[PDB]
Design a protein around this ligand. Structure first.
Ligand SMILES: Nc1ncnc2c1ncn2[C@@H]1O[C@H](COP(=O)(O)OP(=O)(O)O)[C@@H](O)[C@H]1O
Lengths: 1296, 529
């Protein structure tokens, strides 16, 4: 019941809506408390707002009031009719209750219970941030607070300086023995037990392991000083320095009335403010010691000042040291809490902006990419650096000058949001024309005639050319000092426009291309509609198909269509220059912020490639109506299994349209269907049909890699939906849909007559090596199997013979193509067939992880993959097309030339600014929210103590926000914890369900005052990692989408949850390693707590970007003082978070070094020797190397030496490779002529009693020439520990 | 009678674990046994004579060979330690061999083995009986001379000797904010005490004398006059190794022929495991650096001889591996690559005879004399010199910058310094090679940075970072004559590396010998940077 007067002091708009700010210390305003109504006016005397108070905070000059319910008056109401008194002398004034209650309906047309509640969520993220800041940093009870029943040093976690005597001797334990000696024992002890646990954890388990590391202690350290470093302009004389801190003092017993449980008095401390301002002349030399506050003269400020530099500025360093002395009783009165330093200009200067850039720190070397990066980021300027603390600067109107600098203990910074233009009212008019008239509709673009097609596609290129035209007015005007880079930027955009027009021209002068374009658009639109229906059905909701067929769902995004038009002319003709010459063959590289659709961008190219290949014909004497087309290869193991589900839907839609087209007599698409297979290790998938039978046999008393049907969403039961045909030499495994009525096209009622019935997949390896699919999704490490197994050459199309009953044949197989009549099937005979065309496209994802030893090992084995996929056409040699995709680009040119041996073409190009390139727009904080970051660094404490405290603070502050506001707090009620290793996650897992629940239950059960936290019950904990079984993963991902349920109780006056019988519970804490493989854009998750700085920048950007996509996000990185990388990042926090891409760590890919030639050379030689010829294909081919076969050895040797010379660009490497290959070839040549034995590759088969092996495996012996690896990475096998359990008696006894 | 528990990489058996070390597994903790109870017939020998003749001089002529780690029950033998545990549900403290604790296992998935408290009924004892999990207790008792033994719980809780035979519990603070406090309570005597009274100055008045227990040998000494110290479980100051390593060079100190071979006019390249290139020298560093040599193929063998407990080693404080004089020692070998930097002789001799260098040398020798007095050793021997501190500091900074710039792991990189000046063949140079066989920058990644385009940038950034430390006024004011340290102006936040990488143990390091610092100017070796 108060009346105040507004004066509009606060700056941020969201804060100014929901707050009232008063002047003066809170000691005058002690009559105002929580749950109070205040009625806010303006200066003239007009009623504007009516609100209710949530919280009060205070400072040395101002007090801020936060609301929880508020009404905004729309009309104009005067104070004259109000019976009340005007505010006394612009302070607070008391309201009579009755007149306020009577006037609320009379002159405001409202009651108490009709007040609407606050709905914004930026307000809520602000309140949560303030709560955690108060509880971890302080002061919490104001500047004149009282602390009861505990010591001041352990109350707070961050930002405290020790006296100098303590810092030299260090620590051995968090608690000193002499400071705890009370008369009584600690009476508030409780038994150290997992009390009332009820963990409700699923407790899934498996087998996995990771790496390990170590560091020095975080216990034996405490600092006693902090500083900064700033560079100042010349021709000035003096500056102003302000320092403030806080001090604590013990209140004697007769002065308070706070009692313990047993009637005795308790310890009470009190806080007093400190600090003052000084003025310092600018003379070269070390600064004299000075004391700002006279009452504590033994705390200082110091530094040094250096001479003038080459430009006209000066370097100045400043510190702040505690040099006090340690007493014997009440040792905490010599510690300094909450320090801060401010440096500004003098009070009487003419111009304030005197702080300039740090010197560039040049090193007499230039890299054009680096200068381009400095040109792009020219409005992010780094002014100062902190020593044992973080820093902050205030930027003037000029973006190269600053007026104020200071220090921050826990720093924050908010990042702008990348979006695609087209929806806002301030974008380019042509994009709004495209959206409003519907020229990106995928159904519309498949039915247009050719001339309206050119009309529609021309607008994009016209507007791109226009944008480049206004980009050229500012070469020397706005980019001063960077003329060379401002020209090289425009050159590549002009090349991009040229290639777009070339693509449209190729589309105009062809008919196969137009047919393929229409086919790809139709298939993509259908799959895009149906995937959402499948996801809705699998979760058990009730939906129909016509709900999802609206215009929102079947439209393109401009960079995807642009990539498609770029990609056309190289695939529509094998005679294009990109595929016939070894120089200037541009390999496209696509990079973009994560969240935009790169995956649907690069799946359309595969669809177009698949459709166009069957419309060409048997060019060059090669078959072209069947065989493998597109290879799609990845690095990890789990993301492959996640992407296979996405690829199946496209294959299904293509099969549907192929089946519907043939019914009209149109045979352009052919007869053979489209199928897709995996190619991963033998742990996940079976090898032969016998094992596929064994798995189903063991099931009824694993080829089932699918859980639900892609096309319809019916549950797949493994018991009855699998058929394995009998196998005298080989069989075919089929998987059917689980529909019972018979309306799905992939059930047993409809598809039984097709050449490939049911779901068109392949899982078994020998099934793939007989009928090769159209598409393949593999992992990198499987490619090392080429030198072992000789039947892989079917995948590249090197075949001769075929059996009608089994499939394609290789030398040394079971069936030779002849049979008798049996089960009534007619007898058949073998036939000969011309060869098949090798694949056309290679696709690589997560290309930034191809670096280091993995990158080198990929690069050396890629000599064979490029060689085997080649062929001839009119004398020329045709080579495949390569596409890669990354998240961060850095030194891409050398990486692509070393791995793939091509040129590079990064799309989309740079532009002159980081904010306004053509296809992306980096929006503004005033109009769309961002992703705030926050940082915590603290010495002394252990890593478990910091983790427990941060987790408890977030969990209990979120609950307090829930209790007053309701359902908008839902994003911040479930906490995600991201980790870097399995061992540390295992360590934290024990602490999660034992300690945090106990510390969160008893959060308000002592006499210490905690203003913001609240009572919370923790019940549910899950975990997402590689040790979770693959059947259970989609159940956990589908559990994360349930919301916390709320209900309003008028007895307590708040909201409360209640869970009915047989209902699912929401999850409280979720823990996730590297594999944060979130399936969809999960709308709930909006709070993550990173635990430790990752070893890479790309990983940090990938992991932290998942949270906060539909609601505002908030990340808190927890850093440790004892590690170098963490401290280095802490001191430079606010600059690293504004220039991400400038700071990407280095990489290297170097095959053909001696250490990599000692590993990969024999494997590559044998792979090229085996998978290309017929005499060396079978297992007994090792003895065949005669004096008549050596001409193929020369071919392989020449290929390897040529690539080594072309990539290393030095003749020494070529000479070295030639010598190594010659030695290996001669070593092979000696072993052939040793008669008396039968020589082969492995000891295998019934002839093994006289077989002598040639090559080996990594085992007991040291490495050799003939050791051939089985993966791209190996650790030597470990040693196992052998426990002993027994009893030993201890007769010996202790003594003083 | 035996069962598997887990596995570890063969690298860690000679640098972190090994015959005497605590192993903190996910479910339990064990201590590796000695080597005369190892399976000798399943260890593959390693052929290296130049290191065998060095081990035989130290440990006597009876040493036979160097042997690799032993490799369906073949493995390294362990035994549970500490032999007291805690219960999660009832909070009970009791040794393993009273009979109240039982062991569960599953053989196919041996990482899930743990101990159980059979028939737990609650603290008061009013719930249906079940099985709960048992975890070790996390404090031990360490003796400087080499002994480790269980913590004396009964004597500590009863304030000395007592006749009681009750049971014990743990209690916590019961507040939401205190986190580290512990309490021990007797069920019959109600004697209560806290764990804070075992560390610091109060520890001397409260803990009893050492008993003399070598756990890995199952053997007790008669008496031990040293004073004891309490240590945590898994802390880094509980086991230190003694190592002796050599480089495989073509063909009586170890490091003599290494310097003779590496600085020849034409370093040989006909041996399989030694191949070298002479690429370049940077632009700003002409007067100081004379030769920079790259190694494309390198090979290093190791050995293990002993251990020490509380303090790093500097021979009566070292503890053996076996019951008698041993007959073989563990060994290892790694194939890798390295970078060799040589420095100019005349520039160094000019810099050795200045004034501030002599003052800093006098300060360090006073500190060395102060250190060696407090441990009853000869105080006029084994001083390295002043050249050693400068080269050694530069090496530590270079390793830190290799980790910071390239994203490597810190433990992956090892140093080796050459600064002997006693026999009239002066030395100056550092070496840096690779630690593990599967580490960062293994396949030609380190030799990439040996080219003159990258090394100069790395050096410039390394030297320009170390101008002001993060704990700065107190770091440069540090004086080792006052309190007998072996370092001056070299703290954790500017100079020290992990114990795996370091060759000496963070002794004899000082950074003001390299650049101007906040208190000294005229002692620098690199001027104008
Ligand atoms: N044309 C489109 N219209 C609307 N949303 C789209 C479109 N294309 C993709 N998306 C959304 O973007 C997501 C694609 O993300 P993804 O392509 O996997 O990112 P990246 O592959 O770049 O990491 C899909 O889940 C989908 O919801």
């Amino acid at each position: 019941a108060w009346i105040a007067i507004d004066h509009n002091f606060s700056r941020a708009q969201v804060l100014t809506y929901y707050t009232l700010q008063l002047k003066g210390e809170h000691s005058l305003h002690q009559a105002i408390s929580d749950n109070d109504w205040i009625l806010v006016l303006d200066t003239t005397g007009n009623i504007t707002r009516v609100g209710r108070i949530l919280r009060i905070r205070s400072d040395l000059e101002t007090t801020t009031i936060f609301f929880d319910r508020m009404l905004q008056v729309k009309s104009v109401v005067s104070i004259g009719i109000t019976p009340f008194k005007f505010p006394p002398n612009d302070r607070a004034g008391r309201i009579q209750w009755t007149d306020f209650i009577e006037t609320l309906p009379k002159e405001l047309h409202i009651t108490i219970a009709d007040i609407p509640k606050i709905e914004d969520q930026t307000y809520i993220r602000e309140l949560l941030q303030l709560a955690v800041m108060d509880d971890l940093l302080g002061p919490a009870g104001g500047p004149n607070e009282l602390i009861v029943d505990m010591g001041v040093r352990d109350r707070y976690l961050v930002g405290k300086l020790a006296p100098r005597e303590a810092a030299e001797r260090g620590q051995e334990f968090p608690i000193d023995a002499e400071d705890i000696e009370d008369e009584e024992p600690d009476l508030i002890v409780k038994a150290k037990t997992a009390k009332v646990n009820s963990p409700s954890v699923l407790g899934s388990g498996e087998t996995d392991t990771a790496e390990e590391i170590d560091a020095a202690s975080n216990q034996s350290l405490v600092p006693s000083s902090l500083g900064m470093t700033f560079c100042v302009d010349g021709d000035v004389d003096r500056v102003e320095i302000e320092a403030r801190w806080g001090r604590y003092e013990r209140v004697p017993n007769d002065e308070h009335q706070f009692f313990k449980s047993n009637g005795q008095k308790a310890k009470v401390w009190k806080r007093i403010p400190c600090g003052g301002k000084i003025v310092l002349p600018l003379i070269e030399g070390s600064i004299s010691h000075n004391a700002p506050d006279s009452t504590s003269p033994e705390v200082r400020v110091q530094g040094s000042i250096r001479a003038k530099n080459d430009n006209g500025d000066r370097l100045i360093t400043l510190f702040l040291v505690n040099a006090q002395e340690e007493p014997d009783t009440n040792r905490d009165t010599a510690w300094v809490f909450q320090p801060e330093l401010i440096v500004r200009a003098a009070k009487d200067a003419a111009k304030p902006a005197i702080f300039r850039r740090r010197p560039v720190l040049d090193a007499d070397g230039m890299d054009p990419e680096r200068e381009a990066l400095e040109m792009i980021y020219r409005d992010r300027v780094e002014f100062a650096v902190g020593h044992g603390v973080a820093v902050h600067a205030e930027i003037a109107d000029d973006v190269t000058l600053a007026t104020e600098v200071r220090t921050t203990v826990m720093p924050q910074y908010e990042v702008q949001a990348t979006e695609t233009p087209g929806l806002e009212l301030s974008d380019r008019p042509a994009m709004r024309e495209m959206v409003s008239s519907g020229l990106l509709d995928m159904q519309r673009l498949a039915t247009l005639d050719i001339d309206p097609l050119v009309d529609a596609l021309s607008v994009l290129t016209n507007d791109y050319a226009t944008w480049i035209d206004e980009q050229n007015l500012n070469v020397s005007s706005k980019a001063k000092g960077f003329d060379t880079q401002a020209q090289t930027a425009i050159n590549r955009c002009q090349e991009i426009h040229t290639r777009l027009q070339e693509g449209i021209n190729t589309l105009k002068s062809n008919e196969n291309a137009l047919a393929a374009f229409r086919f790809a658009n139709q298939a993509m639109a259908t799959q895009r509609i149906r995937s959402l229906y499948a996801l809705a059905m699998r979760r058990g909701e009730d939906v129909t198909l016509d709900k999802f067929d609206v215009l929102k769902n079947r439209s393109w995004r401009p960079f995807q269509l642009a990539f498609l038009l770029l990609s056309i002319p190289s695939l529509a003709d094998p005679c294009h220059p990109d595929r016939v010459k070894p120089i200037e063959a541009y390999a496209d590289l696509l990079w973009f912020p994560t969240g935009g659709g790169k995956t649907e961008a690069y799946l359309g190219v595969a669809a177009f490639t698949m459709a166009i290949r069957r419309m060409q014909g048997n060019l060059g004497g090669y078959d072209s109506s069947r065989g493998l087309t597109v290879i799609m290869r990845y690095t990890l193991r789990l993301l492959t299994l996640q992407q296979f589900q996405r690829a199946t839907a496209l294959i299904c839609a293509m099969e549907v349209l192929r089946r519907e087209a043939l019914n009209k007599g149109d045979k352009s698409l052919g007869t053979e269907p489209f199928t897709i297979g995996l190619w991963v290790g033998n742990k996940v998938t079976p090898g032969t049909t016998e094992d596929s039978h064994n798995a189903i046999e063991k099931t009824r008393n694993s080829p089932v890699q699918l859980t639900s049907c892609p096309w319809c969403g019916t549950e797949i039961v493994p018991g009855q939906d699998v058929e394995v045909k009998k196998d005298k030499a080989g069989g075919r495994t089929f998987v059917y849909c689980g529909d019972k009525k018979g309306r799905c096209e992939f059930s047993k009622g409809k598809s039984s007559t097709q050449p490939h019935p049911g779901i068109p997949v392949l899982v078994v390896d020998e099934e793939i090596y007989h009928r090769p699919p159209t598409m393949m999704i593999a992992t990198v490490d499987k490619f090392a199997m080429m030198a072992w197994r000789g039947q892989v050459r079917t995948l590249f199309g090197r075949v001769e013979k075929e059996c009608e009953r089994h499939g394609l044949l290789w030398p040394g197989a079971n069936c030779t193509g002849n049979h008798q009549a049996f089960k009534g099937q007619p007898s058949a005979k073998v036939k000969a067939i011309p060869p098949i065309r090798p694949p056309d496209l290679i696709i690589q994802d997560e290309f930034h992880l191809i670096s280091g030893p993995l990158g080198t090992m990929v690069g050396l084995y890629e000599t064979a993959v490029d060689e085997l996929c080649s062929w001839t056409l009119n004398g020329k040699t045709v080579k495949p097309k390569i596409i890669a995709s990354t998240a961060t680009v850095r030194k891409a040119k050398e990486q692509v030339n070393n791995v793939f041996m091509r040129q590079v073409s990064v799309f989309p190009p740079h532009g002159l600014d980081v904010e306004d390139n053509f296809f992306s727009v980096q929006r503004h904080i005033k109009d769309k929210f961002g992703r705030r970051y926050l940082g915590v660094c603290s010495p002394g404490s252990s890593r478990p103590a910091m983790l427990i405290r941060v987790y408890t603070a977030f969990l209990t502050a979120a609950q307090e926000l829930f209790d007053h506001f309701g359902e908008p707090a839902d994003p911040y009620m479930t906490m995600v914890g991201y980790f870097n290793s399995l061992r540390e996650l295992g360590g934290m897992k024990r602490l999660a369900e034992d300690d945090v629940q106990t510390r969160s239950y008893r959060v308000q059960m002592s006499m210490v005052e905690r203003p913001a936290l609240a009572q919370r019950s923790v019940n549910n904990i899950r975990e997402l990692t590689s040790r979770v079984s693959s059947q259970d993963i989609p159940k956990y991902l589908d559990n994360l989408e349930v919301k916390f349920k709320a209900e309003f109780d008028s007895s307590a006056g708040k909201y409360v949850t209640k869970w009915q019988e047989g209902d699912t519970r929401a999850i409280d804490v979720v823990l996730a390693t590297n594999m944060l493989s979130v399936g969809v854009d999960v709308n709930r998750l909006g709070l993550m707590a990173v635990n430790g700085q990752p070893k890479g920048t790309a990983e940090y950007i990938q992991a932290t970007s998942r949270v906060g996509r539909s609601f505002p996000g908030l990340v808190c990185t927890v850093l440790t003082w004892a590690r170098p990388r963490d401290l280095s990042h802490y001191e430079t926090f606010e600059h690293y978070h504004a220039t991400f891409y400038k700071h990407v760590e280095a990489q290297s890919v170097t095959p053909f070094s001696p250490r990599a030639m000692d590993r990969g050379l024999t494997g590559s030689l044998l792979s090229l020797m085996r998978l290309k010829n017929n005499e060396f294909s079978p297992n007994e081919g090792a003895g065949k190397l005669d004096m008549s076969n050596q001409s193929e050895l020369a071919h392989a040797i020449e290929v390897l030496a040529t690539r080594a010379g072309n990539v290393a660009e030095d003749n020494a490497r070529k000479l070295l490779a030639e010598n190594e290959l010659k030695e290996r070839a001669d070593e092979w040549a000696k072993e052939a002529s040793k008669g008396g034995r039968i020589l082969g590759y492995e000891k295998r088969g019934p002839d093994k009693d006289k077989t002598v092996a040639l090559i080996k495996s990594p085992g007991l012996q040291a490495w050799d020439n003939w050791t051939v690896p089985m993966s791209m990475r190996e650790v030597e096998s470990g040693v196992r520990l052998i426990m002993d359990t027994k009893f030993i008696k201890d007769d010996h006894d202790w003594k003083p | 009678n035996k069962t598997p528990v887990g596995e570890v990489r063969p690298s860690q058996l000679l640098w972190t674990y090994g015959p005497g070390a605590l192993i903190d597994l996910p479910s339990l903790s064990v201590v590796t046994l000695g080597i005369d109870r190892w399976e000798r017939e399943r260890c593959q020998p390693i052929q290296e004579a130049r290191l065998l003749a060095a081990v035989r001089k130290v440990l006597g002529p009876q040493v036979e060979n160097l042997r690799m780690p032993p490799f369906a029950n073949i493995g390294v033998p362990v035994r549970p330690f500490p032999r007291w545990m805690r219960c999660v549900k009832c909070g009970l403290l009791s040794p393993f061999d009273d009979g109240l604790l039982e062991i569960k296992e599953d053989r196919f998935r041996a990482e899930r083995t743990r101990f159980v408290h059979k028939g737990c009924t609650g603290s008061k004892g009013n719930l249906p009986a079940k099985d709960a999990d048992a975890v070790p207790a996390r404090f031990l008792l360490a003796c400087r001379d080499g002994h480790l033994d269980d913590f004396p719980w009964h004597y500590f809780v009863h304030g000395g000797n007592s006749t009681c035979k009750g049971t014990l519990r743990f209690f916590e603070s019961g507040a939401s904010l205190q986190t580290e406090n512990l309490w021990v309570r007797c069920d019959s005597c109600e004697a209560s005490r806290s764990m804070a009274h075992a560390f610091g100055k109060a520890g001397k008045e409260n803990l009893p004398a050492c008993r003399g227990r070598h756990p890995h040998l199952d053997q007790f000494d008669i008496d031990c006059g040293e004073e004891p110290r309490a240590v945590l479980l898994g802390a880094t100051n509980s086991w230190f190794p003694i190592t002796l390593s050599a480089l495989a060079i073509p063909q009586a100190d170890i490091k003599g022929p290494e310097w003779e071979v590496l600085t020849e006019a034409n370093p040989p390249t006909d041996y399989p495991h030694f191949m070298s290139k002479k690429i370049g020298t940077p632009a700003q560093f002409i007067p100081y650096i004379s030769r920079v040599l790259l190694l494309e193929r390198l090979r290093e063998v190791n050995a293990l001889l002993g251990f020490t407990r509380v303090e790093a080693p500097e021979r009566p404080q070292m503890a053996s591996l076996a019951r008698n004089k041993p007959e073989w020692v563990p060994a290892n070998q790694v194939h890798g690559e390295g970078i060799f930097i040589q420095f100019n002789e005349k520039t160094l001799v000019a810099w050795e005879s200045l004034d501030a260098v002599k003052q800093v040398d006098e300060m360090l020798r006073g500190g060395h004399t102060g250190w060696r007095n407090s441990r009853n050793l000869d105080p006029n021997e084994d001083y390295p010199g002043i050249r050693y501190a400068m080269l050694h500091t530069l090496s530590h900074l270079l390793i830190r910058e290799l980790a910071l710039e390239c994203g490597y792991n810190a433990a992956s990189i090892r140093e080796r310094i050459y600064a002997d000046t006693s026999n009239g063949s002066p030395q100056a140079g550092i070496l840096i090679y690779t630690a593990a066989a599967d580490s960062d920058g293994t396949l030609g990644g380190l030799v990439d940075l040996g080219k003159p385009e990258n090394l100069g940038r790395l050096l410039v950034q390394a030297l320009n970072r170390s101008k002001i430390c993060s704990s700065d006024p107190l770091c440069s004011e540090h004086n080792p004559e006052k309190d007998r340290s072996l370092h001056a102006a070299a703290c954790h936040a500017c100079t020290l590396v992990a114990e795996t990488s370091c060759e000496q143990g963070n002794r004899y390091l000082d950074r003001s010998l390299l650049i101007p610092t906040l208190e000294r100017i005229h002692a620098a070796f690199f001027k104008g940077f």
